[PDB]
Design a protein around this ligand. Sequence first.
Ligand SMILES: C=C(C)[C@@H]1CCC(C)=C[C@H]1c1c(O)cc(CCCCC)cc1O
Ligand SMILES: C=C(C)[C@@H]1CCC(C)=C[C@H]1c1c(O)cc(CCCCC)cc1O
Ligand code: NA
Lengths: 95, 594, 77, 50
Amino acid sequence: LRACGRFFQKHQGTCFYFGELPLSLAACTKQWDVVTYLLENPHQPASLEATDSLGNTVLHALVMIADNSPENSALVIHMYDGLLQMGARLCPTVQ
Amino acid sequence: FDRDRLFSVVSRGVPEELTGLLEYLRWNSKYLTDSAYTEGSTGKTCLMKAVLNLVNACIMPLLQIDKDSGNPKLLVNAQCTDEFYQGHSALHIAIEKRSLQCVKLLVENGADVHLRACGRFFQKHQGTCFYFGELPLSLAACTKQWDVVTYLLENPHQPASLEATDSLGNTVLHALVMIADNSPENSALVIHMYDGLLQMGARLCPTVQLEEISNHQGLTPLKLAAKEGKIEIFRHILQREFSGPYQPLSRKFTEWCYGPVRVSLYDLSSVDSWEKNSVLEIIAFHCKSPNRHRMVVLEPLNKLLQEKWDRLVSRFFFNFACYLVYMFIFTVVAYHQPSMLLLGHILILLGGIYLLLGQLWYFWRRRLFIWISFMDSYFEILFLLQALLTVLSQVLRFMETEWYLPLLVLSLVLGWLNLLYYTRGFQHTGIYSVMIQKVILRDLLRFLLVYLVFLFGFAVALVSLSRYRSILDASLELFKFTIGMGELAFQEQLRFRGVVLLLLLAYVLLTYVLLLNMLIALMSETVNHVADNSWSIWKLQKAISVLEMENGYWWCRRKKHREGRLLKVGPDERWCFRVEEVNWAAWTLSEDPS
Amino acid sequence: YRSILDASLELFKFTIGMGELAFQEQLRFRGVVLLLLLAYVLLTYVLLLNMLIALMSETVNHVADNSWSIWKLQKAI
Amino acid sequence: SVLEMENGYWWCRRKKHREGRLLKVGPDERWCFRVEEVNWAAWTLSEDPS
Ligand SMILES: C=C(C)[C@@H]1CCC(C)=C[C@H]1c1c(O)cc(CCCCC)cc1O
Ligand SMILES: C=C(C)[C@@H]1CCC(C)=C[C@H]1c1c(O)cc(CCCCC)cc1O
Ligand code: NA
C-alpha cells in the first residue's frame, strides 16, 4: 500500500519522505527486525524492486533521507549494505 | 560576670557550667533577651553564640532554662539590631552552618521560620553582601541544602510558606534567579533547586501558581531572569519538560511524533509580545546585561522572532521605500534650492514634522533604553536629529534669515547616513553593519583625539618656526599627508629651511606609525572575533526593529494579533508555538500528525 | 563644486589619494563646505578600513582545503 | 606609576600611610589586606561578618 499524501511527499514545510511503501518505512526508521520479517515473510513477502510514486525504490529512499549527519550517515550506510546483502539471497538475478 | 560569664560558657559548649545562676534570672528580675546579656555592638545574643559554636549540647538547656523564667518575648526569635547585620536570627545561623540537626532543635522549640534579615549585608550591594533573599526558606535553597528545605516545608509544626515574599517582594524562586551567575557550578545549583521547589510546590500548594508571582517591581521569576541577564536559568525555564506526574508543570510539550520528525509546543504564557510587559519587551529594552544578544537566539525565541519578522518584512520594506521616496524629493529640492518647487518644499516640511513626531513618540514611550544602551539606539538619535534640522531649516527659510542653506544640506548628508539603518534587513550587509560601529567605532574614536593632538601640536610649531602662514592653513596642509596629497619640499626662502623640513619629516614618519599601528590595533579585533557573536547582534537588531514596529505607527495604534494557537494540554488551555525538528538519534499530545 | 558630475568626480579622487581639499576664499560658505568635505574624507577612512577589516575575517576564518577543493572542481568542469 | 608618585613630589616628601589593618591572628599581630571572593563550588578568624 502506497501513502501518497502531502505529508509523505518531499515538501519544504512539514513532511517526512520515507518513500512510499511499508518496506521503505521500516528501512528509513532503522528497524532491522521488521524489514527482515517483511522480506522473509512466508505469506505476502515484500518486494525489493517495488517503486514509489516517484519511481524510487527502497535504496532510493535511503539516499533521500540522508542528511550527512554522523548519526544519520551510520543509519543510512548500515541499512544500504544490509538491503544489498539481503537482495542477493532474495533476488539474485535482479540488480 | 553575667554577659561575659555566659558567653565564655556557651563557647565551650559545656552544660555543666550553664547550671547555676539560672534562678538568678528571676531573682535579679532581668531577662536573657534584654540588652544586659546581648552584646550592644550588634545585638548578638548568647543563643546565636551557642549556635555559632558547633550541635552545641547547650542549645537545648539554654532554651530549657528560658521557658522556666517568664519571658514575654521568645529568645529563639531574637533579631540582631545592628544596621549592617539587621534581622539575623539563630535559625539563619543553623541553616548557614549546614547543620540539619540544629535546625530541627530550634524549629521544634518554637522558632519562627518567617523572620526576615533586612540588614545591609543581606541586601544587594555593590560591595560586601550576600543576597540569598530575606527568609530562612530562601537561605536553605540558595545554600544547596535539599535536606533542610524538605524538612522546613514538611515540618509538622510551623511549616515554611513557599509564597512568602522578601523585602523586595521576591519569593523563593526569585531568590534563585538573583543568585545565578551563569557559572557551570552555579547554573547546576540554581537549576536543580528551581525544579525541586516547583515539584514540591505542586504537592504542598497545588492551587497556588508560584511562577505567576511578581515582586514589588512586577516581575515574574521568568521575567526577572530575562531582565537580570541570567541566561542559564532563563534557558532552562523557557523550555522545560517533565514526567507524567509533573506533566502540567512543564512548558515544552510534544504534539505528535512520526519517526525522526518531531513537533514541539513551547508555552507563551509571558513570552509572546501580545501581552504587555512580555519577555521579548523586557529582553530588548529593559534588560541591560552584556549577554543580551545571547537570549534572542534561544530555541523557542529564535523561531518566534523569525516568524514575527517574516510577517512584517513587507511593512519594514514599505517604511524603507517611503523613506527612500522622501529623499528622492529631498535631493531634488536641495539641488534646485535657489511651480513644483513650492510643492516640493511643502512635502519636505511635512516629512520633517512627520519623522519628528514619530521619533518623539518613540522616545516618549521609552527613554531608559537610550540611556542603558546607546549602541543599540544609535540611529534613534540620528533620525531625530535629521528631522529636527529639516523642520528648523524650513522655519528659517520662511523667516527670511538667509541662514538656512548650510542647515538644509546638513540634513541631506546626515539623512543619507540614516539610510544605512535599513541595511539590517538584509542578511548579507546586516551582519556586516555590526562591525561598522560595534567593532570599529569602539576604538577608532581614540585615534581621532590622538591625531588632533599631533596635528595641532605640529601645526603651531611649523607656522611659528616658518614665520606655514596661518594655523588653519598649516594644519590643513599637514592633514593632506593623510590623503596622500601632502606637499613636502626643501624651501629656499625659509629662515630655517632645514629645521622646518626636519619637523615636517618627523610628522610624516609619525603618521605611518600612527596609521599602521591603528591598522594593527583593529587587526586583533578581527582575528580574536567570534563568528556567532556578530550573528547574534544582528538577530537582536531585528528583534528590536520588529517589536517597535509591531505596535504600529504613532497616529494609528493598530491592534496586534496573538502569535500561537490556544489548545488544551491536560483542563488547562495554554497558547503554544509549534517548532518542528528532525532527530535521527532518538533510537504525545495528539495521535494524528498535522 | 560646479556640476554634479564634477563634484562627484572630485570626491572620487580622494579614494585614489588625489583629492584636492583646501580652504576656499571665494566661496559664500567657506567654512561649511570644508566641514562637509572634511566629514566626507573621514568617512572613507572608516569605510575603506572597515572594508579591509570586513574581508579580513574571511581570510582568517578560511579553510585551506576549501580553496583547494574549488580548484579541483574547476578543473573537473 | 603609583609607586613613584606614592613617595610624593620632590620638594614635599609626603608621609605614606600603611595599607591594611593590624589585627591578631593567634598573640601575633600581622597587617592583613581583605580580599572578598564568592565561591559556589565550596560545597574562621572571627564569627560575625563585617
Ligand atoms: C616602519 C614604519 C611603520 C614606517 C613605514 C614608512 C617609513 C619610510 C618610515 C617608517 C618609520 C620608521 O622606520 C621609524 C619611525 C620612527 C621615527 C619617528 C621619530 C624620529 C617612523 C616611521 O614612519
Ligand atoms: C580612525 C580611523 C579609521 C581614521 C583614520 C585617519 C584619520 C585621521 C581619521 C580617522 C577617523 C576617526 O578617528 C573618526 C572618524 C569618525 C568621524 C566621522 C564623522 C564626524 C573618522 C575617521 O576617518
Ligand atoms: Na595612497
